[PDB]
Enzyme design. Structure first.
Site, PDB file in Angstrom:
ATOM      1  N   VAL A 181      49.185  27.416  42.840  1.00 27.67           N
ATOM      2  CA  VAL A 181      50.130  27.275  43.933  1.00 27.67           C
ATOM      3  C   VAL A 181      49.937  25.977  44.712  1.00 27.67           C
ATOM      4  O   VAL A 181      50.923  25.410  45.198  1.00 27.67           O
ATOM      5  CB  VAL A 181      50.045  28.494  44.879  1.00 27.67           C
ATOM      6  N   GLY A 182      48.709  25.488  44.845  1.00 25.52           N
ATOM      7  CA  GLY A 182      48.470  24.293  45.631  1.00 25.52           C
ATOM      8  C   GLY A 182      47.025  23.862  45.532  1.00 25.52           C
ATOM      9  O   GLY A 182      46.159  24.597  45.049  1.00 25.52           O
ATOM     10  N   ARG A 183      46.778  22.643  46.009  1.00 23.27           N
ATOM     11  CA  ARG A 183      45.458  22.038  45.946  1.00 23.27           C
ATOM     12  C   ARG A 183      45.148  21.391  47.287  1.00 23.27           C
ATOM     13  O   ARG A 183      46.046  21.052  48.062  1.00 23.27           O
ATOM     14  CB  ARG A 183      45.366  21.004  44.815  1.00 23.27           C
ATOM     15  N   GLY A 184      43.855  21.230  47.555  1.00 24.53           N
ATOM     16  CA  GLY A 184      43.409  20.635  48.801  1.00 24.53           C
ATOM     17  C   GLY A 184      42.035  20.034  48.627  1.00 24.53           C
ATOM     18  O   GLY A 184      41.371  20.222  47.604  1.00 24.53           O
ATOM     19  N   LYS A 185      41.610  19.302  49.659  1.00 24.57           N
ATOM     20  CA  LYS A 185      40.313  18.638  49.621  1.00 24.57           C
ATOM     21  C   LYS A 185      39.156  19.621  49.492  1.00 24.57           C
ATOM     22  O   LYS A 185      38.088  19.239  49.001  1.00 24.57           O
ATOM     23  CB  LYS A 185      40.125  17.779  50.875  1.00 24.57           C
ATOM     24  N   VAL A 211      44.349  26.751  45.382  1.00 23.92           N
ATOM     25  CA  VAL A 211      44.970  28.025  45.719  1.00 23.92           C
ATOM     26  C   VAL A 211      45.821  28.471  44.539  1.00 23.92           C
ATOM     27  O   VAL A 211      46.595  27.680  43.985  1.00 23.92           O
ATOM     28  CB  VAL A 211      45.806  27.911  47.005  1.00 23.92           C
ATOM     29  N   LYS A 214      41.995  31.857  46.699  1.00 23.48           N
ATOM     30  CA  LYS A 214      41.572  30.537  47.147  1.00 23.48           C
ATOM     31  C   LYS A 214      40.162  30.269  46.625  1.00 23.48           C
ATOM     32  O   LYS A 214      39.194  30.882  47.085  1.00 23.48           O
ATOM     33  CB  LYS A 214      41.635  30.451  48.671  1.00 23.48           C
ATOM     34  N   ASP A 227      43.934  22.248  62.157  1.00 16.68           N
ATOM     35  CA  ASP A 227      44.553  21.602  61.000  1.00 16.68           C
ATOM     36  C   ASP A 227      46.005  22.053  60.873  1.00 16.68           C
ATOM     37  O   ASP A 227      46.478  22.373  59.778  1.00 16.68           O
ATOM     38  CB  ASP A 227      43.777  21.882  59.702  1.00 16.68           C
TER      39      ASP A 227
END
Ligand SMILES: [Cl-]
Ligand SMILES: [Cl-]
EC number: 2.7.11.1
Length: 329
Positions: free
Chosen positions: A40-44, A48, A63, A151
């Site tokens: 679904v998504g990526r982050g630092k 996810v 996550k 954030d």
């Protein structure tokens, strides 16, 4: 030192076990109970996935955390547990880890979101009012619980547009507000960093989130994303000062006995305040009203103490119709 205008003593009056996240004893669930389905998504700090509970067959969000200190993971879990079930807060269901790699995963109730880069350009005037109001419910709740998100940004606001459901997500940067505490200023994401983070004012509070909200709101009603487009932390203050002007920045630095590094002072220069009406154009005029400008103006102040609280924001005339639609029920 600076202290929060509202919710100042929430963590003074709650027992130590509420805010002492470093002491948390994590009760690990069953890693095998949840399977990834799609990304679904990526982050630092994580990736996810949409997942499934293999027993109940229910959908979930998984996550998977990149390597980080145990204290930081306990902080996110403790905060998620303290906010669990609150209005428009992502809901933590389980905490698991791989027995071989020790990699932890946080399991959340599923949210079917649309990415802001697709959604925001199609949002109507009323939907901006509705969704910002829904986000304010989340911020007033977490602030009332003694927690700063730190954030706030479109990527951390999951909107299920067909169900008109909103969830404030990713509490990995959030902290407990303790009056008198000097916090790390390396929080939030560049475009949404409040001036306090950019001038090294460490005794900040919940009002940091209200600056970030104003950046998001400006980006939405002016269709200008991000609104303050800095190329690094110093340039980010320059972009802000070219809009809000330097007079009120200098007053802000004087009030809190701060001074800019000479390298940053040269970059900031001298600038008049630009009226918000300067950003109106034919493509965005349908989203900009006198009420929208007044509300935005009261969010984007250098002095964190002057910014609207979440409760004051919700009471602003810009949300009059939203409140009436909500009252009718
Ligand atoms: Cl931190
Ligand atoms: Cl607040």
């Amino acid at each position: 030192m600076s202290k929060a205008r509202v919710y100042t003593e929430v963590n003074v009056i709650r027992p130590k076990d509420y805010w002492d996240y470093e002491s948390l004893i994590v009760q690990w669930g069953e890693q095998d109970d949840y399977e990834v389905v799609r990304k679904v998504g990526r982050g630092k700090y994580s990736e996810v996935f949409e997942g499934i509970n293999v027993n109940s067959k229910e959908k979930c969000i998984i996550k998977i955390l990149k390597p980080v200190k145990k204290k930081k993971i306990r902080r996110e879990i403790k905060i998620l547990q303290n906010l669990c079930g609150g209005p428009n807060i992502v809901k933590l269901l389980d905490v698991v880890r791989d027995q071989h790699s020790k990699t932890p995963s946080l399991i959340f109730e599923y949210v079917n979101s649309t990415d802001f880069k697709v959604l925001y350009p199609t949002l109507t005037d009323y939907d901006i009012r509705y969704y910002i109001y829904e986000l304010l419910k989340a911020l007033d709740f977490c602030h009332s619980q003694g927690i700063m998100h730190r954030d706030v940004k479109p990527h951390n606001v999951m909107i299920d547009h067909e169900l008109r459901k909103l969830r404030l997500i990713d509490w990995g940067l959030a902290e407990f507000y303790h009056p008198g505490k000097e916090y790390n200023v390396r929080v939030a994401s560049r475009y949404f960093k409040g001036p306090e983070l950019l001038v090294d004012l460490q005794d900040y509070d919940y009002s940091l989130d209200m600056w970030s909200l104003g950046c998001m709101f400006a980006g939405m009603i002016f269709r200008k994303e991000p609104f303050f487009y800095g190329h690094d932390n110093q340039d980010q203050l320059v972009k802000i000062a070219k809009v809000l002007g330097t007079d009120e920045l200098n007053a802000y630095l004087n009030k809190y006995q701060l001074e800019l590094d000479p390298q940053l002072e040269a970059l900031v220069g001298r600038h008049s305040r630009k009226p918000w009406s300067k950003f109106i154009n034919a493509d965005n005029q349908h989203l900009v009203s006198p009420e929208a400008i007044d509300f935005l103006d009261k969010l984007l102040r250098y002095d964190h103490q002057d910014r609207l609280t979440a409760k004051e924001a919700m009471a602003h005339a810009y949300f009059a119709q939203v409140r009436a639609a909500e009252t009718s029920r």
